[PDB]
Design a protein around this ligand. Structure first.
Ligand SMILES: CC(C)[C@@H](NC(=O)[C@H](CS)NC(=O)CCC[C@H](N)C(=O)O)C(=O)O
Ligand SMILES: [Fe+2]
Length: 329
């Protein structure tokens, strides 16, 4: 018997406005969700998720093996030593079902100063041929800025929830240097489904991806309407119901660090389900040099003894640790 997680739906529309009391009421709801299971659905968010899902499906279903090799990250193509993050993450027929395409800040061009300096975690996006995938790049870059805007608004809610001025986090989340990424993940229907792609949890549950905390400040996720996520509580894992009109939000481990675990990074995992579906996360990352001094909201003086952590060092170590723990995706 598996219970269902309490995942509230929060109308985030006030976070785009100037009614300050309404924004406080949203912040209270974010606080409550963040101290309970750690997940909530953002509704009334203003993003055209129907077009997002359609354009992503057209891409996943039309790209060919030749194109996948040409876009592949270094894990699948040793010629692409500069693609650690951005590019195509191939499936392996008979062994690995999931495949995905990851892209970063569209402002990271060859002329960008972080690219000129060869700073770790910064890469120039690779894209398919425009003639084979017309309008895909335009759509994907536009989507990045659309979800960037939603994420900026959410960060104002988190700041207010913790008793800070609304730009406390958002001031470090800038178009010129954000390390945020979009991943367009396809989970396919397969018959027979490769047994190598199913992991068995300690409790017997069949999984597609094992337990983890997110490498992010917050994670802003759109998924098609197939139930798959579970969140760990002290009484075991609970199912998160799907909603293909909303964005599922949770904190990552950088938030847990800077709040002395007041807002924990919820541990979650992905159940195996044999269904064609999409999982489209946006990982809200700050800039490479961004540092927020930790504080403890439980203490009157907010004092914390935790060391400030540069976001770049956090991200480089976190991404590698996640690969080592849960596998190359
Ligand atoms: C749980 C979902 C978010 C999704 N899982 C994921 O996206 C998992 C766990 S949060 N995330 C990752 O592998 C990190 C990708 C980081 C990305 N390459 C980058 O360079 O920024 C899934 O559906 O498997
Ligand atoms: Fe995650």
């Amino acid at each position: 018997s598996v219970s269902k997680a309490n995942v509230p739906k929060i109308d985030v529309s006030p976070l785009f406005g100037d009614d300050q009391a309404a924004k406080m009421r949203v912040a209270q709801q974010i606080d409550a969700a963040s101290r309970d299971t750690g997940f909530f659905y953002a509704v009334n968010h203003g993003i055209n998720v129907q077009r997002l899902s359609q354009k992503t499906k057209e891409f996943h279903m039309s790209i060919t093996p030749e194109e996948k090799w040409d876009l592949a990250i270094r894990a699948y193509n040793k010629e692409h030593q500069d693609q650690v993050r951005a590019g195509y993450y191939l499936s392996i027929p008979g062994k690995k079902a999931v495949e995905s395409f990851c892209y970063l800040n569209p402002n990271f061009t060859p002329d960008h100063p972080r690219i000129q300096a060869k700073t770790p975690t910064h890469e120039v996006n690779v894209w398919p041929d425009e003639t084979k995938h017309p309008g895909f790049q335009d759509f994907a870059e536009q989507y990045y800025w659309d979800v960037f805007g939603l994420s900026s608004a959410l960060l104002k809610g988190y700041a207010l929830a913790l008793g800070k001025e609304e730009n406390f986090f958002a001031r470090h989340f800038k178009p010129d240097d954000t390390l945020a990424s979009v991943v367009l993940i396809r989970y396919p229907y397969l018959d027979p489904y490769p047994e190598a792609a199913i992991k068995t949890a300690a409790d017997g549950t069949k999984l597609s991806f094992e337990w983890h905390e997110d490498v992010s400040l917050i994670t802003v996720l759109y998924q098609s309407n197939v139930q798959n996520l579970q969140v760990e509580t002290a009484a075991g894992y609970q199912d998160i119901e799907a909603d293909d009109t909303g964005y599922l939000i949770n904190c990552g481990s950088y938030m847990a660090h800077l709040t002395n675990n007041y807002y924990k990074a919820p541990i979650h995992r992905v159940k195996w389900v044999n269904a064609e579906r999409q999982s489209l996360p946006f990982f809200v990352n700050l800039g490479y040099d961004s540092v927020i001094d930790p504080f403890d909201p439980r203490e009157p003086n907010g004092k914390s003894d935790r060391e400030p952590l540069s976001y770049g060092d956090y991200l480089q170590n976190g991404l590698v640790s996640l690969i080592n723990k849960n596998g190359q995706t």
